Amino acid sequence: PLHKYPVWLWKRLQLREGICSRLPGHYLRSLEEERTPTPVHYRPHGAKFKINPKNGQRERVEDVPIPIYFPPESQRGLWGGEGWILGQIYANNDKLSKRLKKVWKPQLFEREFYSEILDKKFTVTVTMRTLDLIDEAYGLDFYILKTPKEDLCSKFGMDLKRGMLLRLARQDPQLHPEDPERRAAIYDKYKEFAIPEEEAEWVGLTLEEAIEKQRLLEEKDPVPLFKIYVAELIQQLQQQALS
């Protein structure tokens, strides 16, 4: 026989089920939206409808999102939105030949940045395209403030963004101790990506890490029923005091 709800949302089904369904609504939104980033190799077409080349017919055409072949190690640093491409190719790029499976891997470089928001130097692998992205953002802190985490497409940079957001919404003196003037200047500079203190709770963590924050959050030593019955008897005594 047949299963009632569809398995195409079975995972999504569990997203509304139980203890994990007690997660923050902001976390639900951040795991719920699926906005797409600009591509690494899928150059965008012009507009909605355009004339056919060999037919001269006004046809609406879209562009294919090429899947980003992300090796695991590139998550350990702040790479760009680029990577490798696991596909195939023809010998002379000619479809009338016997094609073979092929790969397009990136050329990374181990560089370093020194964030004032972090107020520390982090050295990791990045891309020259990622270098250009940071330069166009003019600073790593502003870049962390700028792109979406879905646009980030990297775990380490997402973690760095989470830390930067926590520091910005915290405004603790430990960010710039014995230099509150520089702290205030940076806070004015970093006033753009201000977030609520509650927003730092599930900031950029894994879905498994979201379950982790839940179990670290929803758990507590259970209330004593000696204490509970004592409180109930106190309530009964207060009520009978009016009797």
Partner 1 sequence: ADRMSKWTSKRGPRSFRGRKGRGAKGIGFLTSGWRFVQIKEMVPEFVVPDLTGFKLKPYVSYLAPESEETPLTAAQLFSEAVAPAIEKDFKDNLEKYGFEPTQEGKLFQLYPRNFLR
Partner 2 sequence: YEWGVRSTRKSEPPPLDRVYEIPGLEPITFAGKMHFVPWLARPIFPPWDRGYKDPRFYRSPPLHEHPLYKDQACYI
Partner 3 sequence: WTCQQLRNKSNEDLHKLWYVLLKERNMLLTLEQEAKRQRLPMPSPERLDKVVDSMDALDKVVQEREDALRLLQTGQERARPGAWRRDIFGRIIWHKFKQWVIPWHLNKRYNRKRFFALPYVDHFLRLEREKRARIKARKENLERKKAKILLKKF
Sequence length of the chain is 243
**Using the rule CB under 7 A, is 1 a contact of RNA?**
yes
209 binds partner 2, rule: CB under 8 A: yes
Under the binding rule (CB under 8 A), the answer on residue 217 touching partner 3 is no
∠ at Cα 130 (170, 107), nearest 5°? 135
Q: Which is nearer to partner 1, 25 or 222 (CB)?
A: 222
Which one of 237, 239, 242, 243 is in contact with partner 1 (CB under 8 A)? 237
* 123 is a site residue for RNA (CB under 7 A): no
| Contacting range for RNA; rule: CB under 7 A; set: 96-104, 135-143, 176-184, 228-236 | 96-104
Dihedral sign of CA atoms 95, 100, 101, 102 in order:
negative
User: Does 91 interact with RNA (rule: CB under 7 A)?
Assistant: yes
Q: Is 8 in the site for partner 1 (CB under 8 A)?
A: no
Here the contacts of 129-135 (C-beta below 8 Å, separation 24 or greater) are: 129/40, 129/80, 129/81, 129/82, 130/78, 130/79, 130/80, 130/82, 133/80
Site membership for partner 1, residue 2 (CB under 8 A): no
From 75, 79, 97, 80, select the one nearest 88 (Cα to Cα). 97
| Interaction of residue 233 with partner 1, rule CB under 8 A | yes
Chain residues binding partner 3 by CB under 8 A are: 1, 3, 7, 222-226, 228-229
